[PDB]
Structure formats: structure tokens, C-alpha cells
Write a protein that binds this DNA or RNA. Structure first.
Ligand SMILES: [Mg+2]
Ligand SMILES: [Mg+2]
Ligand SMILES: [Mg+2]
Ligand SMILES: [Mg+2]
Ligand SMILES: [Mg+2]
Ligand SMILES: [Mg+2]
Ligand SMILES: [Mg+2]
Ligand SMILES: [Mg+2]
Ligand SMILES: [Mg+2]
Ligand SMILES: [Mg+2]
Ligand SMILES: [Mg+2]
Ligand SMILES: [Mg+2]
Ligand SMILES: [Mg+2]
Ligand SMILES: [Mg+2]
Ligand SMILES: [Mg+2]
Ligand SMILES: [Mg+2]
Ligand SMILES: [Mg+2]
Ligand SMILES: [Mg+2]
Ligand SMILES: [Mg+2]
Ligand SMILES: [Mg+2]
Ligand SMILES: [Mg+2]
Ligand SMILES: [Mg+2]
Ligand SMILES: [Mg+2]
Ligand SMILES: [Mg+2]
Ligand SMILES: [Mg+2]
Ligand SMILES: [Mg+2]
Ligand SMILES: [Mg+2]
Ligand SMILES: [Mg+2]
Ligand SMILES: [Mg+2]
Ligand SMILES: [Mg+2]
Ligand SMILES: [Mg+2]
Ligand SMILES: [Mg+2]
Ligand SMILES: [Mg+2]
Ligand SMILES: [Mg+2]
Ligand SMILES: [Mg+2]
Ligand SMILES: [Mg+2]
Ligand SMILES: [Mg+2]
Ligand SMILES: [Mg+2]
Ligand SMILES: [Mg+2]
Ligand SMILES: [Mg+2]
Ligand SMILES: [Mg+2]
Ligand SMILES: [Mg+2]
Ligand SMILES: [Mg+2]
Ligand SMILES: [Mg+2]
Ligand SMILES: [Mg+2]
Ligand SMILES: [Mg+2]
Ligand SMILES: [Mg+2]
Ligand SMILES: [Mg+2]
Ligand SMILES: [Mg+2]
Ligand SMILES: [Mg+2]
Ligand SMILES: [Mg+2]
Ligand SMILES: [Mg+2]
Ligand SMILES: [Mg+2]
Ligand SMILES: [Mg+2]
Ligand SMILES: [Zn+2]
Lengths: 86, 105, 50, 59, 134, 24, 135, 122, 104
RNA sequence: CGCGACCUCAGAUCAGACGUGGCGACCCGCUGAAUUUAAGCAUAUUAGUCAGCGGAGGAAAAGAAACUAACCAGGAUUCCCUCAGUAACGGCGAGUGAACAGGGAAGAGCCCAGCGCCGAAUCCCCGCCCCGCGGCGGGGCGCGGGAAAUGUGGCGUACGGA
RNA sequence: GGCUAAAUACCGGCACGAGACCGAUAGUCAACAAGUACCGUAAGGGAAAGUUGAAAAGAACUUUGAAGAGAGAGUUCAAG
RNA sequence: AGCCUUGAAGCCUAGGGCGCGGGCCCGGGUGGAGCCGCCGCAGGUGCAGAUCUUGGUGGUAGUAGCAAAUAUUCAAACGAGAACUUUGAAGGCCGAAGUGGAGAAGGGUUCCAUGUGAACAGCAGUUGAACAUGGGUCAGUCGGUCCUGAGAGAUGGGCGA
RNA sequence: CGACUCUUAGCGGUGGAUCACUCGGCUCGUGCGUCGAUGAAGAACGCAGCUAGCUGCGAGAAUUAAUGUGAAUUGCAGGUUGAUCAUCGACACUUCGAACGCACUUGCGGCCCCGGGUUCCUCCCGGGGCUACGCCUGUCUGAGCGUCGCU
């Protein structure tokens, strides 16, 4: 009775949707995230999880600020100058 | 399992050597980079020599090598005192100066 | 669960809008490589994770 | 009406009162499974709902 | 050969820069040579084609000596559409047959201020090159 | 949809079954 | 001293590494004081530190911390090397005196194993094959 | 008419607010027409109305923030939005004069013994 | 070929039982690649046998006198009449095979 | 008991700044094994290695001898060839294993405390004026507020200095 | 007690160039809506999938069947 | 001064052959865009087996099977098509700890209307929890929100590289 | 000649093997070598006239302004004093996230200033600016049977 009859009792949930990494890995009992470590101030990353590195790096997401940092870098970070109008 | 006859040997490949392999395909690009850096220095200092300041006639230590004569680090303070050149004048006019040397001979 | 929360209801609200298929004009373009919607999630087949 | 989800009932009441020039009896809000807030704005009986609907164009 | 170490001599990279070019490079690539009379008159070898230009077809099934106005220039498929160059679909409607601008000669230009500026700049560069060759 | 996995091993002919046991 | 952070005994391995009590930590307690002060204050930068008193159960160190952002340090050119971003957290890399006493760097025959940048640079420079182009 | 960006800068701020409110009313009318079922002319006009509202708000924001930085230009302390937003490691450097601040003994050595210009013979 | 090609996948062998060919296969999953076989040269995907290294002995050095001997032989064969035509050069109308032209 | 200083220690949504976190291929500081070999295995070997932790930079570290040598003495650090699979270590078994010197790329030196001379001759902040202000600086005017004699600045540091 | 460029390292990032390499069961897992679909509570595991034609010119119209389907006719050098 | 849209590679072949053999050259069909002979050079270079890896397809085989919980029959309508859709009548079952009416966890548009019979409901469907368009959840008084339980978890402090 | 079975050939179906194409990988080399409390990496949610995925953007939401380019995007409709594109230097960037008013239920607060409410008279509603910990310099308020000077 450890199989099919025991699978029917599974209705309450322990993990839930986290709010920093987005993956459903936020434990409700220990109040910690199993993916990124949300009560910890630092992002939980490891070198043994080399495949799970590239799932979450800088090149994966949006880069809404890093691409304009690169765009300002490729012309040497000018600020305040305006081009010559018509 | 060694065979009939040959030299005894100790190959040092028991470590993980394949992670640290210094490939030398940078070599002609580094020769071009040194060439461009030396030409850039020669164009930077226009009347000055491209090699640098002069270097002393130096006898070698360590009796295997004492017959040969090198170009050393710099002139000595007693050498500049006998010549009549101040040590802060010599570095500005292009003369290598080091204080650690002596004059026994 | 009738007792929903706002975060879970918004997460289901986005998936309900993603559940809709493709239109008929999208396979009339030049550089099209889309025949049908391959991300059609059925409510009995894929249980949305969780 | 269909309302942004960040609103209040007082915000919907003052918004209808400002952008329709009409007094509001009460506001009943719900959030649809599409995502936006459906708002049943019950008006005062001095004005007509059919008349203000023909005034704003909906029919 | 090429002596600039930044100019691409790679097939896949050149085809990438061709088929993923923005529209101002699309207009520059889609250019057509002028005729002998206009070439002698303006000393201009080629120009980018416009929607309001006249065209004789040089090569293809619809080649000949017919001067037709361009319908419109469709830069997504790298094509132009000519007025009398068209064929009948089975249902009955006429569809303009696609002609690439490399097989296209111009008989008359549509002249605006920017068009005259481009022609004067090309004539000036041609005279400077002829002076350097002299 | 779900690709039916490799048929779960059913520990049968081993030692706990008294249906098939050779010579001991 | 430092004992091994393991349970009761149970150090799973060869009988070399079962030692737990008589292990000694590689850096000095003065450098431990420096890195604790630098971890408590990331804005302040460690210059050095010194001993004032010791008990059987404690030692006591005065750690000198410097503002790299105050104007009296910034406009003084003798100390503006502290204001450079290269010297951020000297206490962790071991750039102060108590850290450099633990690195074991120096000149001569007594410091062969740290020739080059450090002990790690010495080991990496020694354990590489230089497989040339023409060999 | 085509609401351009050049003529919006010269006008008064209350006229910009009146034009913005008229564009908001006209956008609400086009949304009502879209939901009731309207013309494709209105369905394409609503995008032009959105871009015109974007242009009017952009011109209002320019006339606000250039005037605010003209106001806070003369003072020593200025708000964080008006301070030049560049990278953090470049903002936390030394100043331009403080990179040129040398000590008295270094200035004395640079005065007494400069790097001379010289050449040698063959 | 890169060293990470093939070894990024984790695959423990099932071993005995389960009428399988004793190959390290992908650990579970409800996806086309589940119990398929990752490691080994013969399996689909994975790695090939003998990954070609960056530290191969590409460059061969030649003695300087052998290089100069090759230059001397390549120049001396450019004077004989039959060795040039056996290369394939149409030289029927050339007035002299050691073709020496002026400094203009 | 009251008043006024000094010394320690608090409270501030006080005025002006800073640090937290990410990537981490290279670099630094710790902690750090077992697979493997020794045809077993326990010292050795894998190995200061995989993994774990913390820290910045465009390079990091190191760096101008408490040096190498014993010669007719060389003279900051870093990297390559050679020294060299050598001296040496090791159930002296398996195996591990430098440094000097020479040939080159590069080559740039210095600053404090102390000792002492100078009326604190020194530094920070706030008020006004001029210039410039999108790397908030230069000068003048304040019986303005502080830091500092439990020591700020100039000469001066092993190559002598006053 | 402390500072200091240079020659040195770079499988991360941006812009690039080349190949006695691979040619869709090969090469990065991924040439395509790829860390995507899907599985596992979770840490994590993780695919398959290119080729109409030069131009959609994607078969008008008639006819049997409700339609899926055909038979004529038509486009193209080629519907083999 | 090789072949080639006056037809390259690949593939098929009841043809002519050659070489002991590895294999190779022509004849005929399909194909539409590159290919080979000789001297040297280099390799990720030759498959019948690995309980070989992937993909596909046979005998078994139109076979086992579509057998747990009493049961369906007649007429009419929609429709091209009816045993399974709908309605009327008859006979039954769940027999108030129900095969009824409602909740919690969980599912997340499955709830409702209209149309479809391309794909699923291991037979069939005019039917559906399927497909495609559209709708649907209205609170001071119903719950969360307030409180605390077993516990979790900051500040001071201690420890810790 | 029957049915069924075996071999070969023409043709037609399952199948996508070979060949040729490649906007893609792998390797090597060069230059630059820059994130963040002035809010990073990442995540969530929204944004198209018809828009699911990808791509791009942030309530100004497949983009705003400026410069250059010089008659388009296009799948379908819709309308030269600058359409579309690239650069992007100005403006702007929803909610979590070091995340920062305390917790993560999107709940509950506190202070100040404005508009309805008022006729400062307190609620209520709406809007704006602050309220995370540690630490550096200065200011203010302080405590000490700590060290003192005066009555
Ligand atoms: Mg639980
Ligand atoms: Mg970390
Ligand atoms: Mg043998
Ligand atoms: Mg032998
Ligand atoms: Mg289920
Ligand atoms: Mg050129
Ligand atoms: Mg051991
Ligand atoms: Mg010591
Ligand atoms: Mg001094
Ligand atoms: Mg592979
Ligand atoms: Mg404050
Ligand atoms: Mg052993
Ligand atoms: Mg063994
Ligand atoms: Mg054993
Ligand atoms: Mg060791
Ligand atoms: Mg590690
Ligand atoms: Mg950090
Ligand atoms: Mg940096
Ligand atoms: Mg350094
Ligand atoms: Mg040395
Ligand atoms: Mg030797
Ligand atoms: Mg022995
Ligand atoms: Mg060792
Ligand atoms: Mg040496
Ligand atoms: Mg040199
Ligand atoms: Mg002094
Ligand atoms: Mg010295
Ligand atoms: Mg010293
Ligand atoms: Mg020293
Ligand atoms: Mg240093
Ligand atoms: Mg090249
Ligand atoms: Mg494929
Ligand atoms: Mg394939
Ligand atoms: Mg593949
Ligand atoms: Mg293929
Ligand atoms: Mg195909
Ligand atoms: Mg194919
Ligand atoms: Mg054909
Ligand atoms: Mg072709
Ligand atoms: Mg090959
Ligand atoms: Mg086979
Ligand atoms: Mg049967
Ligand atoms: Mg019930
Ligand atoms: Mg019910
Ligand atoms: Mg069925
Ligand atoms: Mg239903
Ligand atoms: Mg009521
Ligand atoms: Mg705790
Ligand atoms: Mg055959
Ligand atoms: Mg395939
Ligand atoms: Mg959408
Ligand atoms: Mg614009
Ligand atoms: Mg423009
Ligand atoms: Mg709660
Ligand atoms: Zn998380």
C-alpha cells in the first residue's frame, strides 16, 4: 500500500512559487527557498551545478541596464553633450 | 609491465596536467605586440636611444662564468663620485644608477 | 481551490491568456516557420507544475 | 466599466464622478480571470443609466 | 584581394549581413544601373531605385523594350514591382511578377532635392577620382 | 505529451518469490 | 587553536587526516583580528593592527581603519593610494602586515616555494607543460 | 493634424496641459469606439493618439527638467537625478585636481631634476 | 573538439537487470531523452572517441641547411628545359628560359 | 547641592558621504578530501588538487634585500629557454622534485614613524564675492565653528641626514 | 611600516578576423518560438525538430460524395 | 587549356564487362548543380555481431482482448447517416453511512451559450470535461485581514577563517 | 490456367538513408576590458488594430525626443515643413529583488505639505516627499559615588 493507495493522500503543498528566483521552490515549513536561498542575502550558486549555472546567469535574462551600460561604454560614457541641431 | 631492455623512466603525468596546458599559439602575435610596443616607445622618445640608458662593464660571479663580461644593472655611487656626476643628474641624463653595488676591484 | 490568493490568481490569469491558439494571418507572412501553436497546454494533460 | 487592478473603490467613484459628470451611489468591484477589474458602478436614481450610456456612446 | 583586416571575406558572415540588414542598408544594396543616356548626362553609374521610377526589364521572361513605372519597392523580399510586368492568377486577378533590381535599367529618374544632392555628390566624387587618375 | 517512461522494474524473479527457485 | 569542523570523530579517510584537536590555523590571530574588523566595516580600510593585551581565553588588538572617502585623506597625496579601488579589502587578500606574515613570502633560499606571485602562482608555474609550437 | 515635437517646446505649459487633456479625452473616445465596434480608421488613429500623448509628455518632461537643472546649476549641492548618472566605479574615483595634487617634495624633485632631452652619437 | 562536448550530461549506468545493454543512460525524465545513453563514442549524441586536442604537434621544424638546399634545388630546376614543362608551364614561345629582364 | 571643562558611552527620520548584492574565465587569502597508484594496504601518491568560503582589479599578486654567492663577486619585482627530470625527499618502494648562475622581454624608483629644527608654520566644515561649473575646484574676504601638543605640515629615511 | 606602471594570465562580457574542423544520429544541449516543450515536491534532469518552386505562380471552374476524398481542367521546364 | 543545365553528385538496374580479390568502367531510367583521374600530404578513413546507440518496419496478428458492481424495450424529432444525442411511455438500480443536495485541500477556465465532426472519449456518435468564437465570479455584516498556541525568527551578546 | 507459399523485374505505398545546399557550432588569434542604494544580475506582470510563442519595451509600455539616412512598413485594412531604419548623447523606466517603513497575506502604520471636506474642526478620500542595518566627520540633547576647578 506504499504506491498507488499512498499517492492519493498527496493534496497539501510544501513548496510554492518564490518571489526572487520565480521557480516553485519556496518551502513553507522552513521558510527558505530551495533554488536561490531567499532568506540568505546572497544568491545560492555552486560549482558542482555547472549546468544550473547557465540556466541563471547574466546572458540569460533581459539585461535592461547592462546593454545600455555597454552602449555608453562603446563611446566612452559621454554625459550631457547634445548633437548639433539642424 | 616493462619489456626486455630499455631506460628506467619517471613520467610526471600522474597529476591532472590536461587542465593546465600552456598553449604557445600566442607566440607570433606576441612577437608582433612586442615589436609594436618597441616601435611605440621609439616614437615616444624621439632623440633618446630605443634600447635605453647605458649599462656597466661587469665581471661575473660564480667561478664557472667569471671570464665573461655582461651589461649590468647600473653604475655605482663611488663610480659616479669619481666621474663627478651626481646620482640625480645621471638618472635624468640617461644613466642607470643602483645603490646596492660595491667597488672591490 | 476556491480560496485563491492574488498572486496565484494573476499567475493563472496569464496562463489563461497564453492558452489561446495562433491566428490565421500569422502563417501568411514571408519568413514564417510556425504551423501551429506548440505550447497548447491542456488542463488534464499538463498540470501546470506546482 | 473595466478598471486597472491597482484602483480603489473611492478612486473608481471619483473617476466616474469626474469623467462622466454624474453622482455615484456605490461601486462593486471584482477582478476577472482575464486580469482587469470589472466595476459595477451603481448610480443615483436622479440620472438615467440608459441616457448616460447613449451619451457616452455605448449601446 | 582585400588588404583591410576588418572587411569580412567569410561566406556565412556575408550572407548574415545581407539577409539581416536594416532598411537603410537594404535600400543601398537594392540599386539599379542607369541607362547610357542618363549615365552620359549625369556621369552616375548607378542609383538606388524609387517607387516613382521608369524601368526597362533587361533579363528574364518579361524582358524587352517596354518602359514601365514601378508599382512599389518591396525591400523585405529584395524585389520591386513593375506596372505592366504582371501575370494572371488562376482566379483571374493580376499579380505583379517579382523582378530583382539587379536586372533593372532606369530610363527616367524622379528628381527631388535629396536625389539631386546624391547625384551631385556622386558626380563630384567621380570628378575627384578622375583627377586622381589623371 | 508526457513520454511514457521506461517500464518500472518489478523486482520479481529474485529470492523473495517462491515460484521459481532452482537448485540450492 | 582551530579544530576541524566535523562531527564527533568520524573524519572519513586515511589515518593521516583523523587529527582534529591538534590542528593549527594557517593565518595568525592578528590577521584574524584584521579580517574581522574589515568584515565589520567594509567602508573603512585596514592599514595595520597591533597587540595591546592578552588573557588565557582572549587576545586584544587595536586595528587602524582609514576612511578612503574623507577629504583629509583624499586631498593628501601621501595617503591617496588608500583611496584607489585596487586596495579594497586588503585584510582578506592579505595585503597588511599580519596577512603578509601568514603568506610566507620573501627573498632567498628560505622562500623557494613562494617564488613569483604567491604560493599558488609558484605551484601553477611549476606544474604546467610548456608545449611549444615547434617543440 | 500631425502633432510634431518642435512646436510643443515653444508653447506655454497650460496649453500643453489642455492639449494633453484633449488627447486623453480623444483616446478614451477611441477606446470606447474600439470596444463598441468602430472603423479601421479609428483603429489606426488610436496608435497616433498614443504616440502624440507620448510626445506631449516628453516635451513637458524636458521643459521641466532642463529648467530644474538650470535652477540647480549654480548651487554646490544638487539632487541625485540631476547629478550625472554614470557607472559607480567611475563616480567613486578621485577628482581631476586631486589626481594632480602632488606633494611638496615631489614638486621639489620635479623642479630640480626633470627628465632631460638628450641624444647620443654613433 | 571541446572537452565539454558530451560530458555535460549526467548518466549513471543501470548495470545488471532490466534487459538493457549496460550503458550509462540519462537518469529519468518524461522527455525523449530518458534512458537513452549519453557516454561512449558509439552512442547517439555524447562524445566521439579521441577528442582532438589543442596541444597537437601541428608545426614541424626543418634544419636551416635543408631549407637552403630546398631553395637551391627549386631555383636550379628552374633553368632546365624539361623540368619546367613537366611542371606544366606553356613555354613554347618564350625566347629564353632563364628569362632575365631589364631593371625597368 | 549648584555651575564649567576634560575623559569614556549613548540617542538622533540631524547636515554631508560610504558599505551590503551580481558575474567570476584570469588573480589573492583561507578550509580542503576520497576515487587512483603502490598489482593488497596503513607512511607516501592523487594533492594545497575537486568541491566549500570570502575579496577587488582590467589585470591581480609580488617588488626595490634582515638577497644570491665565496667568485677578478653579481644587485628591485614579473615571464620564457637552460640549469633539470639534477641536487634533494620517499614502506629510499610506487613515485615527488626545486633553487642559484647564464641568455633574453621589460627595466623606475621611493615615502613615513623615530632622531632633530621651525610662534600649528597643518587639515576639515559653514557665510559672502569673482571664474568655471555633466570628473564642484582656484583665489580673496570672516575676534565663524572644530580637529590637532596623547603631535598636523615643511627639511629629512640607510644610497647618509641636519 | 608602507606605495609603484612595464614585460605576465584570460574556456566570463562587447566589437572583431581566420580555419588541411564539423555538414543536421556530425558540430555547443540548442543552425528552427532552446535551457524551450515535458518529468520530478524539491535540488535538478532535459529532448525531437532545416530543405515546394526562380517567382504561391498554393490548383480558378465543372462534376460524385455530407465531408475527409477523388476525376477532368489549369500554373510551372518539372505536380514523376 | 579536366568534366558539366546539349545534364554534376546520389539512387535503381532481368544489360556489356574487367580484375584471383578489395572494387571499378560503360548502356537505360530518376535527379537538378557540382564532381573526378595522377604525384605528394593529413585524418574523427572501411562493420555482422558489443543483452551495441538512434530511427523505422515485419511474423506473432486482424490474435489475446474491449467479462468487477441485476436491465433494458418501443415510438417520435433533429440529422445524409441512430443501439448509444434529445423527448414521451413502460420496466429497473443507487434505497437517505446514496449512484442525492453542499463544502475544505487540490485542479484553473474544467462553469454557460452557439457552431464543428479535421484529431481524443481503446465500438460508434448528431454527444462531451474535445475543438473555435464568445460570456460568466458584484460583500462593513461570508472568510483572510486582528490575536495567540506547538513553534519559527530578528536586536543586544557570544561563537565562527 | 486454379487458391496459398518462394525467387527476380517494372510500378505504387510506410520510411527519411545517401548526395548537395547552411542566417549555426567548435578551435585559434586581436583590440577594448565596463555592473550596482543616482537602485545591479535575475524574476514576476502588463504593452500591437487584428498578437499565442520568440524578439523589443515599460502605464510615454513592438517605443518618446535629437542626429544621419532620404519615400516607406507590409500578412491584411487604416492614413518632402520628413515615412522607415541605424546611432542613441536628452527624457522616462510598473512590482518583487542587496530591497530599504515591519511582514511577505499585497496586510497594517507614523510624520510633514497640498486638493475635495473644509471655512484648521477633527475624521474620510486622493496626490507628493521621508521612515533598512552598520559605519566616517561635524552639530544638538544627554548620563556617569570617572578626573577635577569655584562657592
Ligand atoms: Mg510539509
Ligand atoms: Mg556566492
Ligand atoms: Mg609483453
Ligand atoms: Mg623496448
Ligand atoms: Mg490527474
Ligand atoms: Mg578598403
Ligand atoms: Mg594517505
Ligand atoms: Mg614569524
Ligand atoms: Mg615629508
Ligand atoms: Mg556530440
Ligand atoms: Mg541623515
Ligand atoms: Mg592500490
Ligand atoms: Mg589493482
Ligand atoms: Mg582494497
Ligand atoms: Mg601534499
Ligand atoms: Mg574550488
Ligand atoms: Mg563583492
Ligand atoms: Mg571592473
Ligand atoms: Mg598591485
Ligand atoms: Mg634573481
Ligand atoms: Mg639533461
Ligand atoms: Mg623496501
Ligand atoms: Mg607534492
Ligand atoms: Mg637568475
Ligand atoms: Mg631588452
Ligand atoms: Mg613630524
Ligand atoms: Mg633600501
Ligand atoms: Mg623596512
Ligand atoms: Mg619593506
Ligand atoms: Mg603592494
Ligand atoms: Mg590570418
Ligand atoms: Mg536534425
Ligand atoms: Mg535529422
Ligand atoms: Mg543536434
Ligand atoms: Mg541528412
Ligand atoms: Mg526532406
Ligand atoms: Mg532531407
Ligand atoms: Mg525534376
Ligand atoms: Mg537549387
Ligand atoms: Mg576530418
Ligand atoms: Mg548494421
Ligand atoms: Mg478475439
Ligand atoms: Mg455528491
Ligand atoms: Mg452539486
Ligand atoms: Mg471512438
Ligand atoms: Mg461544460
Ligand atoms: Mg448591503
Ligand atoms: Mg537563529
Ligand atoms: Mg536486387
Ligand atoms: Mg531526421
Ligand atoms: Mg499579447
Ligand atoms: Mg522620433
Ligand atoms: Mg528622423
Ligand atoms: Mg497571514
Ligand atoms: Zn527563490
Amino acid at each position: 500500500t506504499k504506491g498507488t493507495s499512498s499517492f492519493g493522500k498527496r493534496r497539501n503543498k510544501t513548496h510554492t512559487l518564490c518571489r526572487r528566483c520565480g521557480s516553485k521552490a519556496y518551502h513553507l515549513q522552513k521558510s527558505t527557498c530551495g533554488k536561490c536561498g531567499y532568506p540568505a542575502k546572497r544568491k545560492r550558486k555552486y560549482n558542482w551545478s555547472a549546468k544550473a549555472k547557465r540556466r541563471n546567469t547574466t546572458g540569460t535574462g533581459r539585461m535592461r541596464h547592462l546593454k545600455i551600460v555597454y552602449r555608453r561604454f562603446r563611446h566612452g560614457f559621454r554625459e550631457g553633450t547634445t548633437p548639433k541641431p539642424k | 609491465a616493462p619489456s626486455r631492455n630499455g631506460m628506467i623512466l619517471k613520467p610526471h603525468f600522474h597529476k591532472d596536467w590536461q587542465r593546465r596546458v600552456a598553449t604557445w599559439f600566442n607566440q607570433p602575435a606576441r612577437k608582433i605586440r612586442r615589436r609594436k610596443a618597441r616601435q611605440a616607445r621609439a616614437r615616444r622618445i624621439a632623440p633618446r636611444p630605443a634600447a635605453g640608458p647605458i649599462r656597466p662593464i661587469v665581471r661575473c660571479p660564480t667561478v664557472r662564468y667569471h671570464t665573461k663580461v655582461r651589461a649590468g644593472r647600473g653604475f655605482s655611487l663611488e663610480e659616479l663620485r669619481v666621474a663627478g656626476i651626481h646620482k640625480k643628474v645621471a638618472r635624468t641624463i640617461g644613466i642607470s644608477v643602483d645603490p646596492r653595488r660595491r667597488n672591490k676591484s | 481551490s476556491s480560496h485563491k490568493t492574488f498572486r496565484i490568481k494573476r499567475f493563472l490569469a496569464k496562463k489563461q491568456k497564453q492558452n489561446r491558439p495562433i491566428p490565421q494571418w500569422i502563417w501568411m507572412k514571408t519568413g514564417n516557420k510556425i504551423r501551429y501553436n506548440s505550447k497548447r497546454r491542456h488542463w488534464r494533460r499538463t498540470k501546470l507544475g506546482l | 466599466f473595466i478598471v486597472d487592478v491597482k484602483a480603489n473603490k473611492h478612486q473608481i467613484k471619483q473617476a466616474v464622478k469626474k469623467l462622466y459628470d454624474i453622482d455615484v451611489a456605490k461601486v462593486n468591484t471584482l477582478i476577472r480571470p482575464d486580469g482587469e477589474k470589472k466595476a459595477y458602478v451603481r448610480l443615483a436614481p436622479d440620472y438615467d443609466a440608459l441616457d448616460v450610456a447613449n451619451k457616452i456612446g455605448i449601446i | 584581394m582585400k588588404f583591410n583586416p576588418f572587411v569580412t571575406s567569410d561566406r556565412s558572415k556575408n550572407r548574415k549581413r545581407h539577409f539581416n540588414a536594416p532598411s537603410h542598408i537594404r535600400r543601398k544594396i537594392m540599386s539599379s544601373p542607369l541607362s547610357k543616356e542618363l549615365r552620359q548626362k549625369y556621369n552616375v553609374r548607378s542609383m538606388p531605385i524609387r517607387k516613382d521610377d521608369e524601368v526597362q526589364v533587361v533579363r528574364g521572361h518579361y524582358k524587352g523594350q517596354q518602359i514601365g513605372k514601378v508599382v512599389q519597392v518591396y525591400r523585405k523580399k529584395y524585389v520591386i514591382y513593375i506596372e505592366r510586368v504582371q501575370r494572371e492568377k488562376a482566379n483571374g486577378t493580376t499579380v505583379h511578377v517579382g523582378i530583382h533590381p539587379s536586372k533593372v535599367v532606369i530610363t527616367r529618374l524622379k528628381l527631388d532635392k535629396d536625389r539631386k544632392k546624391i547625384l551631385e555628390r556622386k558626380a563630384k566624387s567621380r570628378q575627384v577620382g578622375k583627377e586622381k587618375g589623371k | 505529451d508526457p513520454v511514457p517512461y521506461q517500464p518500472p522494474f518489478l523486482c520479481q524473479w529474485g529470492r523473495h518469490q517462491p515460484a521459481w527457485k532452482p537448485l540450492m | 587553536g582551530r579544530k576541524r569542523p566535523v562531527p564527533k570523530g568520524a573524519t572519513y579517510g586515511k589515518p593521516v587526516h583523523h587529527g582534529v584537536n591538534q590542528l593549527k590555523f594557517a593565518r595568525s590571530l592578528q590577521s584574524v583580528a584584521e579580517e574581522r574588523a574589515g568584515r565589520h566595516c567594509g567602508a573603512l580600510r585596514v592599514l595595520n593592527s597591533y597587540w595591546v593585551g592578552e588573557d588565557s581565553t582572549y587576545k586584544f588588538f587595536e586595528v587602524i581603519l582609514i576612511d578612503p572617502f574623507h577629504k583629509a585623506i583624499r586631498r593628501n597625496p601621501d595617503t591617496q593610494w588608500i583611496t584607489k579601488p585596487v586596495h579594497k579589502h586588503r585584510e582578506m587578500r592579505g595585503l597588511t602586515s599580519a596577512g603578509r606574515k601568514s603568506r610566507g613570502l620573501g627573498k632567498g633560499h628560505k622562500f623557494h616555494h613562494t617564488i613569483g606571485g604567491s604560493r599558488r602562482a609558484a605551484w601553477r608555474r611549476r606544474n604546467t607543460l610548456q608545449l611549444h609550437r615547434y617543440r | 493634424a500631425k502633432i510634431k515635437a518642435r512646436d510643443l517646446r515653444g508653447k506655454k505649459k497650460e496649453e500643453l496641459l489642455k492639449q494633453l487633456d484633449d488627447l486623453k479625452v480623444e483616446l478614451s473616445q477611441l477606446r470606447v469606439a474600439k470596444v463598441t465596434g468602430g472603423a479601421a480608421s479609428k483603429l489606426s488613429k488610436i496608435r497616433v493618439v498614443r504616440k502624440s500623448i507620448a510626445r506631449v509628455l516628453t516635451v513637458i518632461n524636458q521643459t521641466q527638467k532642463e529648467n530644474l537643472r538650470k535652477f540647480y546649476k549654480g548651487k554646490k549641492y544638487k539632487p541625485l537625478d540631476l547629478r550625472p548618472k554614470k557607472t559607480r566605479a567611475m563616480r567613486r574615483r578621485l577628482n581631476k585636481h586631486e589626481e594632480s595634487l602632488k606633494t611638496k617634495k615631489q614638486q621639489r624633485k620635479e623642479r630640480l631634476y626633470p627628465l632631460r632631452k638628450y641624444a647620443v652619437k654613433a | 573538439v571541446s572537452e565539454l562536448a558530451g560530458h555535460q550530461t549526467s548518466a549513471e549506468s543501470w548495470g545488471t537487470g532490466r534487459a538493457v545493454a549496460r550503458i550509462p543512460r540519462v537518469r529519468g525524465g518524461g522527455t525523449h531523452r530518458s534512458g537513452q545513453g549519453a557516454f561512449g563514442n558509439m552512442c547517439r549524441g555524447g562524445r566521439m572517441f579521441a577528442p582532438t586536442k589543442t596541444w597537437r604537434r601541428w608545426h614541424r621544424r626543418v634544419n636551416t641547411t635543408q631549407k637552403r638546399y630546398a631553395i637551391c634545388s627549386a631555383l636550379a630546376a628552374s633553368a632546365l628545359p624539361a623540368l619546367v614543362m613537366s611542371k606544366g608551364h606553356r613555354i613554347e614561345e618564350v625566347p629564353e628560359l632563364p628569362l632575365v629582364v631589364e631593371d625597368k
